[PDB]
Design a protein around this ligand. Structure first.
Ligand SMILES: CC(=O)N[C@@H](C)[C@H](C)O
Ligand SMILES: CC(=O)N[C@@H](C)[C@H](C)O
Ligand SMILES: CC(=O)N[C@@H](C)[C@H](C)O
Lengths: 684, 684, 128, 144
């Protein structure tokens, strides 16, 4: 156990990027780039966040680049946003209470105590609703905070308010959003110090993602509908929403998009004359391919810059699959938009023109890798590059003019040493009978990691509308370092393969993806000539559901299994989950708020559940459950365990009393990973 | 009360420098300078410490200089030290427990939990003993931490160690050093991770201020004698000490200086061939003029580079009065030492040659101001400049070669806006009869602040071996902004006027400085033509003693008085304090550890105390006391309060249950200053 | 035991005890507001040994039926009351008053402090 | 307490008559005690002078309290001593024992000190009383 602990300690040392920004240009010309990183500290068992600054000397060419100091750790900062002119900086600090501070130069101008003013609830620090935008006149600030609930008192109170409403019910936004019922927009005036709440938001709509309108005349935001229920919003992009505009005074409200489809991620051009957002056509799957829509502020017209790619639009594009656009995504000319999207089994950067409509891949070609865009200001792009055999690295590039975007040169600000003991490849698989009639000819892919008589570990992704990409993954890397070949499968229904691949999966979950994973395993075993005696499985959420199916439907093909927060019965889950729609859609039914599932519905769900094969399982199973998982009730894993236990099947259960669907806490993640490795090693 | 609160809020916004360092030189040449600042936050009622980085492009000339980012607040950092080569950085973090972390590039290499290793007590964060020095081979670290006390248990303990020694007595180092009895030197090996305590320090000596010897063969430190008592060490530079060298292995110990005089602040030359320190000849006064001594490592010889100036050595030098030399003080040539010392009523920077022995003032001439040196590396000097009418500002300069040091040019990295409503001047006063026989012809000075029928506020300094300098003082500035002329008096016995001025005061405390302050007040009133009806006093500590003497001996000359932690009875003070020698020296008798005072000594201290003049006081008084004060016990003010209350004189008292001799807490300082200002405004 | 007392009324309808006085609320000069300012750290003298934070006691009377609490208004300003009991007929309160002018000398293990015996009517504040 | 004052007087004036001594919160210097206590009249009455609220003692009064204090006989003590002090004592301040301890330590006389950070003039806490009694018994048994 010492070697594995040392290996985990060594592999957890590498940091990861979190955000980036660009400073003002100084004529001596050169610019400063501020980078924020995160790392795992095992001695303290926490996530340490620090900052670092770099200097780039430019003449439309990167003349020079280098570091400009050391790394300073910061604690207690939730949200921050530099001024549009770069003069000031607004920071939110959680010192029990919440503070809003305005730094300028080398002194703190003023700090406001938000709690003692008694005007709203705690601020929002999430990414779905959290926002902090400076005014165009640089005199006001805007953010989103919880509403104020009227005070309540008990019936029997000793007095030297509403009585009896102490324990009323307030509904939250499902997973990982405890005690977040109805947000509201707050505007703070720096000079006077007053805080005012806007009075034009419709009653049945929760606002978010707000930013100031051109001219500082109003606020443009995205409104989500919460009538009559509040469905879960994490890892879901099919909730009904719209784009609204509200004047500061008078409470006038106006609608800017269709009200029967999800719209998200609005951004404003530097010319302050157009807005671009993402629109999702269907509401059935939790993740799909959206379209990039554009709205003209003056002409008051709407258009579709990009559309949904059915299978593939060329050999470089497959659709837009990003939930949130970058905070800075426009160009200096205010005519091009740069984003990052998955493509097949990798991630790439794309540039789209808002007039012609063409999409060009800047990172096209090569052997692979994952690219992520952090910011773009004045045609200067900051990018993080990662590959399965090298930790993430930082790069800075310049965007060339239109028509020659593919000839972009990068400068390496920070490069991390690679691991030359890991070799990765991508395999393309074609299904046999197993192909449907409506969608034929689709193919899927699998990523294989091998060292540069070998046991294998098979890992399907969750979702099921998610995907694996060739990026730096800690656990597959450490498993390969231990001596295990790792195979990550992207079955039919993943993201990055077109809309048809996503739409094929619903209604067939349980009998189509399992066969795909089994076929991939069989083909890899036949071709690469590994050890067929020792083959293991490992999965979470939907991956866990799949894993259980495989070990039951195919009894003598695996030698172990480590599942986490798995789905064991769809029927029982419906009444105990924040996203009851998922069950209906996946099973093949249309979710309806006003509907009580019949016997037919129940039957179908049970036939697709992996508990119907439980009596055959004979592979040792390691179960890890999060007592506070609100996406997949932790009772699901328990019922599978009981069955296997009664039939005397070796099962070990490790219940974490505070973990959720992600089990991301450093203490939980460190233990889970460690235990898993030992289990696999022992049995295999 | 609103105007005063707004004025205090405005004047407390200006930050203050704390430290500085210089980064490695990068050939594109330019360097990075790291500055640390501190500020007072009134909304949170705390002291906020943040960091900032600047870039200086040099060709022996400052070609360019500018900012290189924003300010990031850091919390939980106690001690830090960059690597000698600049590659790494060691930080001490108080995350309940104590952590020692080694940062390199953009990742934390390793962090050590010091408490769980169970090898020593908590580390030392003070300036007298605290030290953190990198090894010359860059592989080890050294620091100072409390010793390990053997575990103790009660007589009646339920068991499923020494019994009875639970409540033993451990003596501390007086004021502001609670629970600090016997420190020890600890050495940490970064590779292995082991911690070892040195085993050559003599039993009756407490070590500190350690640094690595040339060649990484031993440790050179300063040892303080604590036999048989532990006298107070804060604000005192007359404790017996010596310079010792201890080998890492074998416990060999060697002496490098005289053992009958105080020696402090040793530094090593970049050539690693000489050491320079400060030696104090006498032990009677708590602050005196020292001499700069030099020791050759190879030749094993000692010399006196500078000596004690009796009255004045030229029109630019008056002696060395700094307790601690800067962390970096040598030059590239390893032949010159730059320090900062007071001179008359200002502060200046001096450069001293270790071969010729001449001392040259770099900041000589001009109208005034206070200069402080933060660091000097490769002949690049970082300096803070402050004046009573402008907050501190940052500057960077280059040291010219020998013989032309006075022609130094400064570049302003950060400049603060000045206050043009304050005018300051320096007045020289000659005493009449009042002059002694042994020391005749001495003169003192006073700083006068007036706006650019005027009441005056007179402030004598504490000490009494301290001094006022023309620097940025918050309270005099805000009093002048309110409309009060402020007069700060540097009576005979202050620092910066030669050794004779310091030596004249002892034995005459109570009848010589009071007359000096009264003469200064009378001369200023006669000359400047202010309002003689409204004159107020405000002194702290020893100044309070002088203020009580003044209001007792001259009842019809003042209209108010504010005193913080005054000294009222020397005879009663002697029995309960950490510096019993102070009372004996000020009275006029030599202090002996093994002695008991007679009746004549008690009669002397009773005659010199201000309580003797208590039944003649007729001016309203306001007292501020710290219940946990250990230098001047808080009963001293209460007996004066009782005496004044018995005679029915208006007295107001404010007692702070957790304050100390300095009243340095943000809330305590704010409340005390506001109360004093309101009292002065109401009565005058 | 020096000042503590709890005595039932003769009509069995009231209770009497001794409790510390009420100090007016104080706030700092710089307080964030959605009282006396500056008097936060004022000095209140106690009764020496083993009587920390006990400056000026007062007599309180509680009516069991209604539930109201009333403080008596006849005690002299320069006297601290104690050891009270109900007068015959439930017409007044008889107590022992200790003098605390100008200082508050220690009272534990000391029986030489100036004192007197006082009688105060419930209504009207008459003292004898 | 006062018994400790008498015990210190006895071990000072008659050095060759006792073999041990245990004192808890003693009174060592009356003149220094007067300034810091809640009963300043006790010192004046015991010295022999009438106590007046509006008065300041002269040199003769200080001389009297200095002559009556046991510290005057400190350089003649030759018996091992054990002191127990309460850091929060307000009747007899805890510095009184510490000055005697310092004087005895300067002359190299075996002295043991135990300081209780939260005790009072009575040492009435259960743990404090148990520890003090056990330490006193062990000291007496070992030395005698
Ligand atoms: C959309 C979602 O969260 N599904 C769960 C079953 C799992 C975490 O996959
Ligand atoms: C050295 C000393 O005791 N100083 C106090 C009297 C005062 C803080 O000045
Ligand atoms: C009344 C008094 O001061 N007693 C102490 C000396 C001691 C507890 O006896």
């Amino acid at each position: 156990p010492e070697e594995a602990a040392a290996l985990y300690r060594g592999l957890s040392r590498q940091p990861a990027l979190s955000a980036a920004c660009l400073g003002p240009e100084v004529t001596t010309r050169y610019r400063t780039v501020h980078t924020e990183w995160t790392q795992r500290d095992l001695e303290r068992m926490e996530n340490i966040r620090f900052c670092r600054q770099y200097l780039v000397f430019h003449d439309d060419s990167v003349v020079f680049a280098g570091p400009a100091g050391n790394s300073v750790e910061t604690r207690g900062e939730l949200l921050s946003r530099e001024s549009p002119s770069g003069t000031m900086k607004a920071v939110l600090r959680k010192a029990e209470k919440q503070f809003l501070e305005v730094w300028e130069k080398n002194r703190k101008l003023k700090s406001f105590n938000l709690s003692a003013l008694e005007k709203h609830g705690p601020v929002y620090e999430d990414d779905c609703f959290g926002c902090l935008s400076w005014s165009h006149s640089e005199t006001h600030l805007l953010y989103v905070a919880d509403k104020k609930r009227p005070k309540a008192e008990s019936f029997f109170q000793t007095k030297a308010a509403i009585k009896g409403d102490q324990f009323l019910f307030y509904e939250d936004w499902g997973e990982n959003m405890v005690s977040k019922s109805t947000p509201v927009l707050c505007v703070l005036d720096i000079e006077s110090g007053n805080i005012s709440v806007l009075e034009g938001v419709p009653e049945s709509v929760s606002p978010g993602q707000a930013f100031w309108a051109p001219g500082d005349t109003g606020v443009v935001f995205v409104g989500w509908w919460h009538e009559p229920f509040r469905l879960g919003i994490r890892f879901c992009t099919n909730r009904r929403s719209a784009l609204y505009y509200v004047d500061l005074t008078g409470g006038k409200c106006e609608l800017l998009s269709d009200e029967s489809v999800a719209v998200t991620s609005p951004r404003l051009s530097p010319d302050q004359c157009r807005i671009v957002y993402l629109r999702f056509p269907s509401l059935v799957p939790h993740q799909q391919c959206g379209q990039l829509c554009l709205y003209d502020w003056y002409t008051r017209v709407t258009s579709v810059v990009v559309d949904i790619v059915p299978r593939q639009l060329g050999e470089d594009f497959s659709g837009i699959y990003c939930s949130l656009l970058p905070l800075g995504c426009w160009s200096a000319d205010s005519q091009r938009v740069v984003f990052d999207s998955p493509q097949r089994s990798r991630q790439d950067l794309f540039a789209v023109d808002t007039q012609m409509g063409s999409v060009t891949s800047l990172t096209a070609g090569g052997s692979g890798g994952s690219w992520k865009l952090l910011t773009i200001d004045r045609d200067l792009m900051v990018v993080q590059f990662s590959t399965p055999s090298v930790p993430p690295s930082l790069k800075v590039g310049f965007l060339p003019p239109a028509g020659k975007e593919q000839a972009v040169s990068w400068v390496s600000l920070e490069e991390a040493e690679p691991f030359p003991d890991i070799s990765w490849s991508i395999r393309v698989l074609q299904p046999p009978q197993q192909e449907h009639v409506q969608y034929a000819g689709l193919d899927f892919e699998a990523i294989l990691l091998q060292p540069s008589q070998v046991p294998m570990v098979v890992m399907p992704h969750g979702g099921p509308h998610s995907s694996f990409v060739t990026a730096w993954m800690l656990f597959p890397a450490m498993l390969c370092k231990m001596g295990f070949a790792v195979l990550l499968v992207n079955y039919r229904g993943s993201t990055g393969f077109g809309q048809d691949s996503i739409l094929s999966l619903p209604g067939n979950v349980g009998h189509q993806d399992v066969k795909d994973v089994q076929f991939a395993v069989e083909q890899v075993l036949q071709e690469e000539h590994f050890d067929a005696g020792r083959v293991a499985l490992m999965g979470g959420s939907h991956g866990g559901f799949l894993s259980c199916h495989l070990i039951g439907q195919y009894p003598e093909t695996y030698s172990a299994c480590v599942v986490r927060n798995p789905v064991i019965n769809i029927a029982s889950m419906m009444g105990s989950t924040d996203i009851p729609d998922w069950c209906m859609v996946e099973a093949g039914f249309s979710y309806s708020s006003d509907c009580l599932p019949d016997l037919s519905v129940w039957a179908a769900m049970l036939d697709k559940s992996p508990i119907k094969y439980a009596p055959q399982v004979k592979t040792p199973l390691l179960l890890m459950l999060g007592q506070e998982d609100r996406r997949v009730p932790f009772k699901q894993g328990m019922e599978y365990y009981r069955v296997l236990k009664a039939r005397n099947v070796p099962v070990r259960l490790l219940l974490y009393p505070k973990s959720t669907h992600a089990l991301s806490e450093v203490e939980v993640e460190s233990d889970s990973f460690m235990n898993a490795v030992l289990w696999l090693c022992t049995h295999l």
